[PDB]
């Protein structure tokens, strides 16, 4: 309730705590789902590269 310490001050911290895992997980999910479709198309013929394309 202070001038320098308002009540809505944890709100920005709890928004910043959530938005650190949300956007990184969203980008990591795009990276995984975009690489994996290319893996499952490449390694049908020539399955030797399956542990190398991971």
């Amino acid at each position: 309730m202070t001038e320098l310490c308002p009540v809505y001050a944890p709100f920005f911290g709890a928004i910043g705590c959530a938005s650190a895992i949300i956007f990184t997980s969203l980008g990591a999910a795009y990276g995984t789902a975009k690489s994996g479709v290319g893996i499952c198309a490449t390694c049908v013929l020539r399955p030797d590269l399956l542990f190398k394309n991971i």
Partner: protein, 369 residues
Amino acid sequence: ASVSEGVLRKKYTKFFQENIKTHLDLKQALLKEEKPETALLAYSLVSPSGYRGEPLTERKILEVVSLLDEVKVDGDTYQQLKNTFDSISKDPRMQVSLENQYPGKGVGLLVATGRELHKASVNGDAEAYHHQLEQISQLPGRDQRLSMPMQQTLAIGHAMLSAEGAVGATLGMATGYGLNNEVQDQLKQGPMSGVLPRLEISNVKGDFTFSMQEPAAVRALMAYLGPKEDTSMSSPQAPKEAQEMEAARLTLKQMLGSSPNEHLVPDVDSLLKLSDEDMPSQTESTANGAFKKLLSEDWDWLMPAVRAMDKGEAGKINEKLTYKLPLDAANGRVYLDKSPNLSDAQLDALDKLGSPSQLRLMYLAEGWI
């Protein structure tokens, strides 16, 4: 060329035009032509119990079934059927066959809906099993006279039970007659099934008469034709009354296509299993598993496998039922092939059975193996 049918009710339109609503003088209006050796024979389907305690003395079905029996082209096959049926209705083995197939004569919403949908699906698979079983008797070497109306009765009863289960599940889920009558008359159209004789029964209880267009009598008839003949009942050393009923039973069992030493006992029970004397011969259970694997994986793999098996080509089944379908994968369409992966131990057992008997294939479609 065992049987042919027609469905146009305007050729013999004299006996169905006016209000002929009485079995009294129904045979008197039945002559009406130069029919002398072909008029009283068609009345014989409704002659024993068609007046003697008959409701309404007619109906729409019971009189239309009598003039669709045009027998003017030849009257030998149905004459042998009239001599074979009702000569079989004397023994007590036929009497007990007509007693096992006859009577004496919240989360509970999820459970009831599960019962009704199980009824719908189980009675819906068997209709398809019988629709791919009336094209097996279309093949050369089979019959189309005793097989065709016998397995066009069972498909109608299974279609009715499937519609009854779906209507019950819908009426139960939407809450917790006119719909069942709308599916009943709809299946009465299309082709016309040939007639079979009536099988009247006169025992100490009374004069009973069943129909053979109802599925209970059909389902009770093929259980009678199951077992092989024993050391009695066919020898010329107790020739009392057996050469008129057991000869008729054997000519029906052969007319289906079954050998006289095939057993084929029904297996639906809650009791202990088929003990050892009614238990199969270990090259039949393997073959039955092969037939059940053919039914369970495609809707069109029983008739070409039976067609190949009648030619003695029952080792070539794996490479004649294979066919290719597309698969749109992540690397373009690939056209994989679906094939029945029969093992060798069940591919030579289909060589042990020469030709599948139609009686075995009808226990297969009804679920008794």
